[PDB]
Design a protein around this motif. Structure first.
Motif, mmCIF file in Angstrom:
data_model
loop_
_atom_site.group_PDB
_atom_site.id
_atom_site.type_symbol
_atom_site.label_atom_id
_atom_site.label_comp_id
_atom_site.label_asym_id
_atom_site.label_seq_id
_atom_site.Cartn_x
_atom_site.Cartn_y
_atom_site.Cartn_z
ATOM 1 N N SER A 8 0.909 -1.136 -0.208
ATOM 2 C CA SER A 8 0.183 -0.058 -0.032
ATOM 3 C C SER A 8 0.859 1.152 0.075
ATOM 4 C CB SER A 8 -0.933 0.030 1.256
ATOM 5 O OG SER A 8 -0.399 -0.172 2.374
ATOM 6 N N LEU A 11 0.025 4.347 -2.376
ATOM 7 C CA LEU A 11 -1.505 4.849 -2.212
ATOM 8 C C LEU A 11 -1.411 5.572 -0.836
ATOM 9 C CD1 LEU A 11 -3.662 4.735 -4.254
ATOM 10 C CD2 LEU A 11 -4.919 3.237 -2.638
ATOM 11 N N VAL A 12 -0.511 5.151 0.198
ATOM 12 C CA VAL A 12 -0.348 5.996 1.308
ATOM 13 C C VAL A 12 0.526 7.209 1.239
ATOM 14 C CG1 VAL A 12 1.077 5.973 3.649
ATOM 15 C CG2 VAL A 12 -0.615 3.940 3.069
ATOM 16 N N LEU A 14 0.205 8.813 -1.716
ATOM 17 C CA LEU A 14 -0.795 9.736 -2.459
ATOM 18 C C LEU A 14 -1.719 10.516 -1.158
ATOM 19 C CD1 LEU A 14 -2.159 11.149 -4.556
ATOM 20 C CD2 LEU A 14 -3.499 8.913 -4.722
ATOM 21 N N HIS A 15 -2.073 9.676 -0.158
ATOM 22 C CA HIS A 15 -3.013 10.110 1.080
ATOM 23 C C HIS A 15 -2.014 11.353 1.490
ATOM 24 C CE1 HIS A 15 -5.076 10.115 4.672
ATOM 25 N NE2 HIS A 15 -3.945 10.365 5.362
ATOM 26 N N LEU A 16 -0.751 11.159 1.929
ATOM 27 C CA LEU A 16 0.132 11.974 2.631
ATOM 28 C C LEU A 16 0.246 13.274 1.683
ATOM 29 C CD1 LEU A 16 2.862 9.843 4.244
ATOM 30 C CD2 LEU A 16 0.728 11.028 5.418
ATOM 31 N N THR A 99 -9.794 10.678 0.671
ATOM 32 C CA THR A 99 -8.613 9.606 0.828
ATOM 33 C C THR A 99 -8.587 9.245 2.497
ATOM 34 O OG1 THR A 99 -6.154 9.152 0.670
ATOM 35 C CG2 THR A 99 -7.022 11.595 1.098
ATOM 36 N N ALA A 100 -8.246 7.749 2.620
ATOM 37 C CA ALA A 100 -8.109 7.515 4.122
ATOM 38 C C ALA A 100 -6.944 6.474 4.241
ATOM 39 C CB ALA A 100 -9.486 7.047 4.681
ATOM 40 N N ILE A 101 -6.368 6.339 5.405
ATOM 41 C CA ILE A 101 -5.562 5.417 5.905
ATOM 42 C C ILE A 101 -5.890 4.627 7.081
ATOM 43 C CG2 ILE A 101 -3.721 5.952 3.788
ATOM 44 C CD1 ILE A 101 -2.331 7.056 6.369
ATOM 45 N N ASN A 102 -5.541 3.417 7.099
ATOM 46 C CA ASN A 102 -5.990 2.833 8.593
ATOM 47 C C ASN A 102 -5.154 1.528 8.707
ATOM 48 O OD1 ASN A 102 -7.685 0.789 7.484
ATOM 49 N ND2 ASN A 102 -9.335 1.293 8.579
ATOM 50 N N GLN A 103 -5.359 0.816 9.901
ATOM 51 C CA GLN A 103 -4.883 -0.607 9.909
ATOM 52 C C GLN A 103 -5.772 -1.608 10.284
ATOM 53 O OE1 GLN A 103 -2.455 -2.699 11.575
ATOM 54 N NE2 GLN A 103 -0.856 -1.815 10.422
ATOM 55 N N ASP A 104 -5.543 -3.050 9.985
ATOM 56 C CA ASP A 104 -6.222 -4.094 10.225
ATOM 57 C C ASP A 104 -6.361 -4.200 11.610
ATOM 58 O OD1 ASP A 104 -6.599 -4.878 7.681
ATOM 59 O OD2 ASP A 104 -4.751 -6.083 7.797
#
Lengths: 111, 879, 52, 23
Positions: A8, A11-12, A14-16, A99-104
């Motif tokens: 990822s 794509l992370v 791009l989010h930043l 846009t968003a990012i997270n963790q399992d």
């Protein structure tokens, strides 16, 4: 910034870049990723874990799916706030609206 | 008109609320970020922020010989880089050996940083907690155990250095590993600060780690003597250091709201690039000035507002002058010449920690701000002549200097630059004065301690004892709240319950040595469901509930509700009976003891629920089933109060004509003995494998006691003059049926295991004839216990004024060979908060979850405790 | 109502803007999702002789 | 008198909406 969040990463990145622009830190930004496999290590390691498709094809969402396979590539974007693209007279190819990012978190295993 | 005055008042209030929301939203992108916890392992034996302070405060040079235990002249090392408590984190020895020590160090440090933030790391599961780590891949694995190949892959992925923390602690915010060379950890702090300022995370970890498993960075400008002489004339290169440093950060508004202690505040941060410098690896003075000014602009401050800088100061001939020039231009002008910027570098003490250097410097400056002293930077023979020190008000910390805080808050910058050209500068500000209402203390507040192994629990007690001896500490209630709400309840548990002085200390010392103590409760915690047990006869005592009515507003409220329900069917006050007021009847009457026991059991069960204990099932014995059915949701308070009050009044005509006796014999042998009396006697209850109660006429019982006297059988007459569960209650069948008329038996919300049928029962079946049957037939308590044990029940809580069925339950649990355990609530002559806290702590010890905020209060003044006593083992791949 | 693109489909411009999500998950557990939207449609010059 | 208070609120509401949209 060089980001490493495994598959990822870009794509992370791009989010930043998007958040950096939203906070006024940047006027424009490059967001992307790159992969070159000068050694055959990723094939020998992940085929031991039986994660790769014997025929080499990623059969996305198919009944015949039997693993993934590695690829080389470079992919980059030049991004800017929509208001600055309109003001600067730049041609808008598409807009990153959300846009968003997270963790399992606590999954059924690290991988 | 008056309407315009009323309209203006409400309109200006809306405008005041709108302007506030506009101001808060605009300033959100530059809101101060509170540092609430920190953790670190750095060269020279440093393993905590105070250890780091004691190293810089004492001007210690931690540079020392290369490690002899890695199969490889001096540098900064973590000689225990391979020491890890794999068991604690659920990692097998094979997975730990092939795991990069940088990942292992980031796990223990992150657990410690959350503990130092006053946060139980286990309660962070499911939270929007982000993890930002600055790290680079090293040559730990190029030889790994057979089968552990899958572990070698994730165990050496730089992305997993951050992701593993989120996996192990169940954190749901992003986990990002970043690599900006020797500025990585300070860029990760900047990204964690941006993430919090965007509302992406509620809390975040920001840090870095460096481990050099192989000698390589030393082969690739190094100082011959191995010392980083930051800004000194003798500067002749840098030297590398191993380390880990992490921070727990949160938005200042959230820290104030949640009551977290603020250590320092990140007022501003900025990141940028050198751009077109004179070489890729060369630094740029103009870019370092630009990043300092961006951090200041972001903080809403000017150069003169910052008192000191924790410089990058690697000790190289190239870097040191360039950095000082940028500090002189960005911070040296527009300030009083007599208040110069003080510059120092932790690299002179331990060496260049690479990715981890920036945050190790932030920890150093937080400790300098909290101690009020700017420590010296080592090896400055003279300020380097490659800098024009006269062109600006910037001075080196050649010796320690005091830091005042009367005029304004202490402020300091922290810098970090990298070979790839990306720079970072953060501005720290002293934590604001925290405004303390002083709540009252709770008597006999339990002090909880737990750890993953018995040896680790002894180490927790030993470390807590040393901590309290070396530090003057707050009232025992503040220490109890910190131990119960800011620390994880692990498997091996111990609680200290006492209201006396000079007792908790010797009890901790006894716990640390493995010896017992009067106020010390120990045990191993348990999976397993909970049952609330409601006995019938025997738990009462004169004066029960009186101490709790005075000292427990919750119990007083439940007893008051029970009184309102009982008034419509009784000619006395429940409050008056419990207190023993002038004119009230005593427990010698069956019609006052059964309804009073009902109210005590119901109120004690509601009190356990108030303290966070919600039963998965409820079981009752004879009368106790009315209280159990009420707690089960099958009977309302008015309906349950009606049955127990009118059913116990219906028993009165039987007074003196019969009784009950307990025999230490199994059911079959008790039924074999009872034969020569026919219907005059009956099996009243079967409680355990060697506990049967018999009931009947007072004549046949006296003859039965004579028979038991001849044979070796223990027999004890119950102090009651009624033959419950015998052919005698057929004489009052119609009145006992009338006692439960006009009831609305509702379905159960919690399963009720009936001792009439031996199985769960629908609450709608608890009709008039059911309550007659409960009074007439055998209480199958052992059989119903066996059914509960079979359906996964392992915690039995007797919600009583005194334990009655505990020995019987324990006898049954032993017969089935289950891990189950039993605890009471109060004991005879011990119905106070001290006993209630002893029962709660005892239940907690067995693994039942107590809401300690309901017991000790929602908020107290924070009290920092030691971090977890890790039982580390050595894990190092021998190449 | 989620269908795979077993064959190509025309993406009409009429009515509302075209929008699509993009996903990227990793072995370390960090997920990313981005929502793209079509360029807005709200986006007379005389010539300059012998323009180099 | 309330026209100035209402005018201020209309400005602040618009500024709050466009600041939130800019984020």
């Amino acid at each position: 910034v060089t980001i490493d969040t495994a598959c990822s990463s870009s794509l992370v990145a791009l989010h930043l870049a998007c958040q950096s622009l939203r906070q006024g830190e940047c006027t424009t930004a490059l967001a992307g990723g790159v992969t070159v496999m000068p050694t055959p290590t990723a094939f020998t390691e992940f085929s031991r874990q039986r994660g790769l498709a014997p025929d080499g094809r990623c059969k996305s969402f198919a009944a015949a799916a039997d693993g993934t396979n590695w690829a080389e590539g470079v992919a980059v974007l030049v991004v800017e706030r929509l208001s600055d693209a309109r003001r600067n007279g730049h041609r808008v190819l598409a807009v990153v609206r959300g846009t968003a990012i997270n963790q399992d978190g606590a999954s059924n295993g690290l991988s | 008109e008056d309407r315009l005055r009323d309209y203006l008042k409400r309109a200006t209030a809306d405008l005041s609320r709108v302007r506030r929301q506009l101001q808060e939203t605009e300033a959100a992108s530059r809101e101060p970020i509170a540092i609430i916890g920190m953790a670190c392992r750095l060269p020279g034996g440093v393993d905590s922020p105070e250890g780091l302070w004691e190293l810089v405060d004492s001007g210690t040079d931690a540079i020392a010989g290369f490690p002899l235990d890695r199969g490889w002249k001096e540098a900064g090392f973590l000689y225990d880089a391979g020491e890890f408590d794999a068991g604690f984190f659920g990692i097998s020895p094979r997975e730990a050996v092939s795991m990069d020590p940088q990942q292992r160090l980031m796990l223990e440090a992150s657990w410690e940083a959350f503990e130092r933030a006053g946060l139980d790391p286990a309660r962070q599961r499911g939270t929007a907690t982000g993890v930002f780590v600055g790290a680079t891949a090293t040559g730990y694995v190029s030889e790994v155990p057979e089968g552990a190949e899958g572990f070698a892959i994730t165990g050496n992925m730089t992305a997993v250095t951050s992701g593993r923390i989120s996996y192990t602690l169940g954190l749901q915010g992003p986990a990002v590993t970043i690599d900006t060379a020797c500025s990585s950890s300070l860029v990760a702090l900047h990204l964690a600060c941006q993430s919090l300022r965007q509302g992406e995370c509620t809390t975040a970890l920001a840090g870095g780690v460096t481990v050099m498993p192989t000698p390589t960075a030393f082969t690739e400008g190094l100082a011959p003597d191995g010392r980083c002489k930051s800004f000194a004339a003798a500067a002749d290169g840098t030297n590398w250091a191993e380390g880990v440093a992490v921070l727990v950060v949160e938005r200042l508004s959230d820290a104030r709201r949640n009551g977290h202690r603020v250590l320092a505040v990140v007022r501003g941060t900025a990141i940028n690039q050198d751009g077109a410098s004179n070489g890729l690896s060369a630094p740029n003075d103009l870019a370092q000035e630009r990043v300092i000014r961006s951090a200041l602009d972001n903080a809403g401050l000017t150069a003169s507002d910052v008192d000191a800088v924790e410089a990058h100061g690697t000790g190289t001939t190239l870097g040191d002058p360039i950095e000082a020039q940028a500090l002189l231009a960005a911070y040296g002008h527009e300030r009083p010449a007599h208040r110069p910027l003080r510059v120092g570098s932790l690299k002179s003490n331990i060496g260049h920690a690479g990715p981890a250097a920036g945050v190790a410097g932030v920890i150093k400056m937080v400790m300098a701000m909290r101690h009020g002293v700017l420590p010296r930077s080592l090896h400055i023979d003279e300020p380097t002549p490659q800098v024009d020190w006269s062109s600006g008000a910037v001075t080196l910390l050649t010796e320690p200097v005091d830091w005042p805080d009367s005029d304004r808050p202490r402020r300091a910058g922290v810098s970090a630059f990298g070979i790839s050209g990306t720079n970072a500068h953060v501005i720290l500000e002293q934590a604001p004065t925290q405004d303390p209402q002083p709540a009252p203390p709770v008597p006999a507040a339990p002090w909880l301690l737990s750890a993953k192994t018995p040896a680790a629990l002894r180490a927790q007690a030993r470390r807590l004892h040393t901590h309290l001896a070396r530090h003057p500490h707050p009232d025992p209630t503040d220490i109890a709240h910190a131990l119960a709400t800011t620390r994880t309840p692990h498997e091996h548990r111990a609680a200290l319950v006492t209201d006396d002085h000079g007792t908790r200390g010797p009890a901790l010392a006894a716990l640390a040595e493995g010896a017992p103590d009067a106020c010390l409760i120990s045990g191993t915690a348990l999976k397993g469901r909970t049952v609330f047990v409601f006995p019938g006869q025997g738990s009462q005592w004169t004066g029960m509930g009186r101490e709790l009515l005075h000292t427990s507003p919750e119990f007083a409220a439940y007893i008051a509700e029970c009184e309102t329900a009982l008034n419509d069917f009784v000619d006395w006050s429940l409050t008056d009976v419990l207190r023993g007021t002038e004119g009230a009847p005593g427990y010698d009457r069956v019609d006052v003891v059964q309804p009073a026991l009902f109210a005590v059991m119901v109120s004690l069960a509601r009190l356990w629920q108030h303290h966070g204990i919600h039963p998965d099932a409820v079981i009752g014995h004879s009368q106790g089933e009315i209280a159990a059915a009420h707690i089960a949701g099958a009977l309302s308070l008015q309906d349950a109060a009606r049955i127990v009050a009118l059913r116990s009044q219906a028993l009165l005509p039987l007074a003196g004509l019969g009784g009950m006796t307990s025999l230490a014999l199994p059911h079959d042998q008790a039924l074999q003995l009872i034969q020569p009396w026919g219907q005059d006697l009956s099996i009243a209850s079967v409680n355990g494998p060697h506990s049967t109660v018999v009931s009947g006429t007072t004549h046949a019982l006296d003859e039965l006691h004579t028979t038991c006297d001849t044979q070796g059988v223990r027999a004890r007459r119950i102090p009651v003059d009624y033959a419950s569960h015998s052919a005698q209650v057929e004489s009052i069948r119609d009145t006992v049926l009338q006692a439960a008329t006009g009831i609305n038996p509702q379905p159960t919300t919690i399963p009720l295991y009936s001792t009439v049928t031996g199985q769960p029962i629908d609450g709608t079946q608890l009709d008039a004839d059911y309550w007659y049957t409960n009074l007439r037939h055998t209480v199958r308590f052992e059989e119903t216990t066996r059914a509960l044990l079979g359906s996964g029940h392992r915690h039995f809580i007797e919600t009583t004024a005194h334990p009655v069925l505990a020995l019987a339950l324990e006898e049954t649990i032993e017969a089935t060979g289950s891990d189950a355990r039993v605890t009471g609530t109060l004991r005879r002559d011990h119905g106070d908060l001290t006993q209630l806290h002893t029962a709660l702590a005892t239940a907690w010890t067995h693994g039942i979850d107590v809401d300690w905020t309901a017991v000790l209060g929602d908020r107290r003044t924070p009290f920092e405790l030691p971090t977890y006593a890790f039982q580390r083992q050595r894990y190092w791949l021998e190449p």
